[PDB]
Curated annotation (Swiss-Prot):
Residues 137-303 form the JmjC domain. This is Lysine-specific demethylase 4A. Histone demethylase that specifically demethylates 'Lys-9' and 'Lys-36' residues of histone H3, thereby playing a central role in histone code. Does not demethylate histone H3 'Lys-4', H3 'Lys-27' nor H4 'Lys-20'. Demethylates trimethylated H3 'Lys-9' and H3 'Lys-36' residue, while it has no activity on mono- and dimethylated residues. Demethylation of Lys residue generates formaldehyde and succinate. Participates in transcriptional repression of ASCL2 and E2F-responsive promoters via the recruitment of histone deacetylases and NCOR1, respectively. Changing residue 133 to A: Abolishes histone demethylase activity. The chain holds residues 6 to 353 of 1064 of the full protein. 2-oxoglutarate binds at residues 127, 193, 201, 236. It comes from Homo sapiens (Human).
């Protein structure tokens, strides 16, 4: 409980030498207590760039843009997705920067944040989300979201299963007021998010050690949804204002991600946020040894069946051989300490 005791969102500025080993640097920031906030920012070296120029993706296709309809009141909302026809990045950007959809004028972030929560349910925006692809140049070896080199790859490499968006990269083309609802990652994995260009992306995060409190709140406020899946928040449709969190004593922090910056989310870190205007982000999941225990206890959506589900078997057999027999029987009653860093952090 001694590292990052206030559990506030931390920001890191790795040197080029520190930057080169991804898994090692994650181990480092966890040794600093970064994981306790559920979310961390990493600012890459000035020298580092994922791609020389972004003026050649104009014809990139967004096959399934989503119009985000939001209904609700008193800081509690549900988001409904309407799939729109395919469109190109040009067409998206022109719509995004049009007077109908562009960022309103404002002075400070808190003003814009207020505008977001006041106008969430009006003028439904369009989000170019979940686009399969990468904007990295193929020769970039540092923090390449396409090939992060973590133990998550045991899913693809050993068992030959590709899960789109999970061990493959996703692109997100945002515009003003496009939202991502409160969620942890599938199987309570880590996620990494790089903002390639454009207006900022703002984030809310709840410390993993208080994630159960957010779940109780959500269940209380959406009792119908709670009855259908135990894990209805995994639907990613649930929006809850910071005013409501504050009212019910749920600790959280806020951070704004700027172009050229990484965000890292940690296992069982609930997060949500919105885009300030036209931008493009790239995202995927990854794992560390610490994640394995979260994966084994992750509570999954029960109402759908096509939901992302990863067999933990290969991970327990490889990294926890001494409890594999116990776990297969279902007698593994390990309790997770959310304040503990990943073992790989010992050297720090
Ligand atoms: O930018 C977004 O739409 C949300 C990304 C996200 O939830 C993540 O990177 O874990
Ligand atoms: Ni996420
Ligand atoms: Zn469900």
């Amino acid at each position: 409980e001694t590292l990052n005791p206030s559990a506030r969102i931390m920001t890191f500025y790795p040197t080029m030498e520190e930057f080169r080993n991804f898994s090692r640097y994650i181990a480092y920031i966890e040794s600093q207590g970064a994981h306790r906030a559920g979310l961390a920012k990493v600012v890459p070296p000035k020298e580092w760039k994922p791609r020389a120029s972004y003026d050649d993706i104009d014809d990139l296709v967004i096959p399934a843009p989503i119009q985000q309809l939001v209904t609700g009141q008193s800081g509690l909302f549900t988001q409904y997705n309407i799939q729109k026809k395919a469109m190109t990045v040009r067409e998206f950007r022109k719509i995004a920067n049009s007077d109908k959809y562009c960022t309103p004028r404002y002075s400070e972030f808190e003003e814009l944040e207020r505008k977001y929560w006041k106008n969430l349910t009006f003028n439904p925006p369009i989000y170019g989300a979940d686009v399969n692809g990468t904007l990295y140049e193929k020769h970039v070896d540092e923090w390449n979201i396409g090939r992060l080199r973590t133990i998550l790859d045991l899913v693809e490499k050993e068992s030959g299963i590709t899960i789109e968006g999970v061990n493959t990269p996703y692109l997100y083309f945002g515009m003003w007021k496009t939202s991502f609802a409160w969620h942890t990652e599938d199987m309570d994995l880590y996620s990494i998010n790089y903002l390639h260009f454009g207006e900022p992306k703002s984030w809310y995060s709840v410390p993993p050690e208080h994630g159960k409190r957010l779940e109780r709140l959500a269940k209380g406020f959406f009792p119908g949804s709670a009855q259908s899946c135990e894990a209805f928040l995994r639907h990613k449709m649930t929006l809850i204002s910071p005013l409501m969190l504050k009212k019910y004593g749920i600790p959280f922090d806020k951070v704004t991600q700027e172009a050229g910056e990484f965000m890292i989310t940690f296992p069982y870190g609930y997060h949500a946020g919105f885009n300030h205007g036209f931008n493009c982000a790239e995202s995927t999941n990854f794992a560390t040894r610490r994640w394995i225990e979260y994966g084994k206890q992750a509570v999954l959506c029960s109402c759908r069946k096509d939901m992302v589900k990863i067999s933990m078997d290969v991970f327990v057999r490889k990294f926890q051989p001494e409890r594999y027999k116990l776990w297969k029987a279902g007698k593994d009653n390990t309790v997770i300490d959310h304040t503990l860093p990943t073992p790989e952090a010992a050297e720090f």
